Structure formats: C-alpha cells, structure tokens
C-alpha cells in the first residue's frame, strides 16, 4: 500500500530532520547569544543544509499523492512537506527574492534618519526614533520622526516591495494559490475533517464579521482618547476627525499603550506598576523566571528541564558578547528547551517571562508528537497561550498572593477601570490597526489596488477602518507599510487579531473550569490544576488535530469568538459610553491637519 510506503518515508524523514533541525536551531541560538562573524557563517551553513534537505524531502513527498492516503495524520505530514515554497520559481528568480527579502530586512534593521533641518548625527529607529514616539509630547518632533522614517526607509523600500509583490505572487500561483495572500490564509485551511473543515476565504469573512461587534467598543475608546489628546496636543485635534498618525505612543500607532500617561481615568489612584516593589524585594531574573516556574506547577504542568536552566540566557550577557535581546523561547528538539531574554527587573519583563514560558510549556506538551506535528494548531495558537499567562500574572490577587502587592490596597471600581483602559489601549487598540494593515496587503496581492493608488488606498483606509489620518500627504514615492517590521520581514500579520480573540476565548473556559466567581479581568487560575489539565489537552496535540477541533476541546466552538473579549472590557465599555455621552463617537475621513 502507499499509505504504508509513505509511513516508511516519514519515519526516515523524522530521523534525519530531528538531527538537521536541532543542528540548525542551535546555530541560530549560538549567533543570537553571541553575534560573531563566525556564528553567522555556521548559522548560514546550518540553514543552507536544512533548506536543501527540505527541498529534496518535498520533491519526494509529491510522489505520495494524497487521494490514495486514507489516514489523517499521514496526510497532514505529507501536505506539510508537499506544500510550502517548493522553489517552484527559477534559480534566477528564487534567488533575487531572497536578496529582496534580506535587503528589505537589512535597510529596516540598519535604518538611520537625520534631522531634515539639522542633520549632524542621524538616529536609528531603536532606541532613538522609538524613544521619541514613546515619550515626546512635542507635536513637531514626533512628526519629524514619523515622516523621516517614511520619508527615507519607506521610499528606498518602495521599489523593492513592488518586485517582492510580483515574484511572491508567481510562487503562490505556481503553488496553486490565487495570490501570495491566499497562501498565508492557508494556515487556517482545514480540509478532510467533516464538520470542522475551514476555507482560505472563511477567515476573511469571520475576520470582518467578528470585527463588526468590536466597532461599538473601539469607537468609544477612539472618542475618549481623541478627547484626552485634544487636552494634550492643544491645537491639532478635530473633535470629530481622525487622529494624527504620529500621536499614538509608538511609530505606527500599532499600540496605544504609551498614552496611559495622557488618558488615565484617575491619575490619583497609584499605578499597579510593581516594578519598584520588585526592586524593593530585590528580585533577580532567576527569581522572575523561577516565580514563573512555580505558576505552571500550580496548574499541573511540569517544572522546567534542568537543561533549560543550564542553557537558557535570562540576563543580558554583557559587552564581551553582543546578543539580540528580543524576548524569545526556543525548541531545538532532543529535549532541549531554552529562553533567550535580557531580563530587566520590571513589571513588563516580569509579565514577559510568563508568555515566553508559555511557549516552552506548549513546546513541551507536544514533543511526544512527530516532527511535522510538533507545531501550534495554527499561527495564532502559540501567542494566545502566552498572553493568557500574562492576563493572570497581572491579576492583583496574583500580585498580592505573590507578595508584590501588600494584602492591603483592596481593588476599587476606579482601579478596575484604570486596568481595563491600560489593557484596552493595547489589546483593543491593535485589532483595527492589524485588520486594516493586513486587509491592505490581502488586496494588494489580489491585484485589486494598482501601484499608482497604493498609498492612496493606504491612508484612505487608515481613516476609514482605523480612524487615523496622515499628518502629511504622501505620494507614490512612499512605502509606509514597508516601514513596519512584519511587512519588510515578509510576515503574515493576521495572527495577532486571531490570537487576541482566542486568548479571551480560552481564559473564560479555564476560569470557568477554575470556577472563578467575579469578572474575568481578575481570574488568577494560579492554583487551578483542573484548568491546567484542560489546557494540556489542547497543548499536547500540537498540529495533530485541525485548529477547529482543538478549539472545541476547550471552549465549545470551531471558529473564533468575540463575545468573550467583549465581556472582559464590558465594565469599561459602559463607563466609556457615559464619558463620551456629550462627546462625538465616530470620525470623519475628510478631516486633515494639513488641509
């Protein structure tokens, strides 16, 4: 039989990959933990080897056509190896694309912009331009950073992105995909499981339909923030118009986290930031992550491996070796789990420990599975697991139980609202940003937006869906999208919208399993084994089951739900409407500060 002829190919595959994959994930770790011209080369060699293996492997797995397979697990594994890349394009084309990809990710990383009126020492996005966008209250300066980044990095990236859009589509169509867009939407595509199938288009619709129910809550926050922004930036905000893009707490307005200073409901109540308490308890990065360890043990998951503590880097290495410090978890296989994090005794970092040590628990649970089915159920399942961790490590009950918050300071309705806004500014703020951004690309790939009207339908859309207006007019020399990481780093972005729904869609269930009594915003599940089990029963599967069924194992649904998210922030949606009573709720795309 071919089913068994195949079963034989996967077992030989599993054996040789696990070796070559470990060998490559180690070199990537080695490099990020010690940037050296040497570590680079190794990384490159290790990767060049893995790529060639997967190339041959895919070619071989085409020779086991799916219609003869009856078994599910084997077809998933075969679909994986069969689909994906396939270097369907010529060597000539399949190399330029790499160049474009690298060069695009190169200019962004090496991006340096100087003062258009005072250029002596140009500044880099991190940490200068970002520091200005996070901290400045000076309209003129925030505007200098914003435009400059898009006036230079985005323009030089414009010519490249167009080529990228072309070849990427060729590969997708040659990979049996309408456009490179339809491809990225395949991650959610479920075929073969009856009652749990999912199309590459059902997502766009769900995305849209799920995003409607959200419009009630986002407008009311848009209003509130609009109002507080007029207070801060005095002559620059129309009481009915969109919000200048450069006034949003970061460079793209991706998040509105850094506007709390300017939007707090009650500046009187002391902020939760327990960073000081930690500095007072003199917690060390080891304590922070070990404190994280105790959390999962309480819910019924295991301790970290020792090799985790032996191998992981939880502190800035030093000036002896340069190390990329993006908080990151790693799975190399052969039992090897590690985290790479330059921890800084802070409440954020503290919370980030719990996210990164959520992937490790996820990465572990599903290490019983075969190579190809050692992955999260979809591109959004991993992030959601990490977030639900933070959502309970911040519950004051947790902070008080932990001892970072004295048993005093009982929560008052004022403190709760401060929390739900702090939260909404970040979690809610990004869904429209995210939806808009992707949808722009979805269309760009669909060929629906000509280049001559790229940047037109860009802002046209930021004003319609997001409520954000360009502080300055941009022509077709500009590639503002490209001036965000995920764009010039060729990364599917919708994962953030889906994970946000799943995280609430998940917590409610585990909290219900934890038999939590009050609002979900104060559910610690810091000693709920029952809930740790329910999780482990989705975690342990990896990509073995389709995500629809995985979702059901825990929630009671086969498609993302918004109404759990709406219940979370609902005590702020009611207080937001009351505040926005005498205010205008909604925006006018026509308004422009530059008109």
């Amino acid at each position: 039989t071919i089913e068994e002829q195949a079963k034989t190919f996967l077992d030989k595959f599993n054996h040789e990959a696990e070796d070559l994959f470990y060998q490559s994930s180690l070199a990537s770790w080695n490099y990020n933990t010690n940037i050296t011209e040497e570590n680079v080369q190794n990384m490159n060699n290790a990767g060049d080897k893995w790529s060639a293996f997967l190339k041959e492997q895919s070619t071989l797995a085409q020779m086991y056509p799916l219609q003869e397979i009856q078994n599910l697990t084997v077809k998933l594994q075969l679909q994986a190896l069969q689909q994906n890349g396939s270097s369907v394009l010529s060597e000539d084309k399949s190399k330029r694309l790499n160049t474009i990809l690298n060069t695009m990710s190169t200019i962004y990383s090496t991006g340096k912009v100087c003062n258009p009126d005072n250029p002596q020492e140009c500044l880099l996005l991190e940490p200068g331009l970002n520091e200005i966008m996070a901290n400045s209250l000076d309209y003129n300066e925030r505007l200098w950073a914003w435009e400059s980044w898009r006036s230079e990095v985005g323009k030089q990236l414009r010519p490249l992105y167009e080529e990228y859009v072309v070849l990427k589509n060729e590969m997708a169509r040659a990979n049996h995909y309408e456009d490179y867009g339809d491809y990225w939407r395949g991650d959610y595509e479920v075929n073969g499981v009856d009652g749990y199938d999912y199309s590459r288009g059902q997502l766009i619709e769900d995305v849209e339909h799920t995003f409607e129910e959200i419009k009630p809550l986002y407008e009311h926050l848009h209003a509130y923030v609009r109002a507080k922004l007029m207070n801060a930036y005095p002559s620059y905000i129309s009481p009915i118009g969109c919000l200048p893009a450069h006034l949003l707490g970061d460079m793209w307005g991706r998040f509105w986290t850094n506007l709390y200073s300017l939007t707090v409901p009650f500046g009187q109540k002391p902020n939760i930031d327990v960073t000081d308490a930690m500095v007072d308890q003199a917690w060390d990065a080891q304590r922070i992550f070990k404190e994280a360890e105790k959390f999962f043990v309480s819910v019924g998951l295991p301790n970290m491996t020792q090799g985790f503590w032996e191998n992981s880097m939880l502190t800035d290495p030093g000036n002896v070796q340069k190390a990329v410090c993006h908080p990151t978890a790693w799975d190399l296989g052969k039992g090897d789990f590690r985290i790479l994090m330059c921890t800084k005794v802070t409440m954020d970092d503290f919370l980030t420990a719990h996210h990164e040590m959520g992937h490790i628990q996820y990465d572990m649970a599903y290490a019983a599975q075969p190579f190809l089915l050692r992955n999260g159920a979809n591109e959004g399942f991993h992030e959601a697991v990490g977030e639900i961790m933070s959502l309970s490590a911040a519950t004051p009950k947790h902070l008080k139980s932990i001892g970072l918050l004295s048993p005093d300071f009982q929560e008052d309705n004022e403190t709760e609202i401060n929390f739900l806004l702090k939260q909404a500014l970040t979690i809610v703020g990004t869904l429209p940003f995210t939806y808009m951004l992707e949808k722009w690309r979805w269309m760009v790939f669909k060929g629906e937006i000509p280049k001559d009207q790229w940047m037109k339908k860009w802002w046209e859309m930021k004003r319609e869906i997001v409520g954000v207006v360009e502080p300055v007019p941009h022509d077709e020399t500009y590639c503002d999208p490209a001036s965000l990481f995920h764009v010039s780093n060729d990364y599917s972005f919708i994962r953030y919208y889906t994970r946000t729904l799943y995280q609430f869609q998940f917590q409610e269930a585990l909290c219900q399993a934890a038999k939590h009594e009050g609002p979900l915003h104060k559910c610690d599940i810091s000693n709920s084994t029952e809930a740790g089990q329910k999780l482990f029963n989705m975690l342990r599967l990896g990509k073995s089951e389709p995500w629809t069924l995985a979702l059901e194992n825990v929630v009671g649904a086969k498609n993302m739900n918004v109404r759990p998210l709406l219940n979370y922030f609902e005590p702020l949606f009611t207080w937001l409407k009351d505040q926005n009573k005498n205010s205008f709720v909604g925006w006018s795309t026509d308004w422009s500060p530059y008109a």
């Binding site: 060699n45 790529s51 993006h326 990151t328």
Partner: peptide, 17 residues
Amino acid sequence: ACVRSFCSSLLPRIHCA
C-alpha cells in the same frame, strides 16, 4: 515554508540564513 519553529518570535530575516 517553515514546517517547524525554533523561536516563538519573528526575528529579523538577517538573523537567519
């Protein structure tokens, strides 16, 4: 592509081969 992930993050492509 990508049939299995090492990091749970999207690091730069320059930090890859």
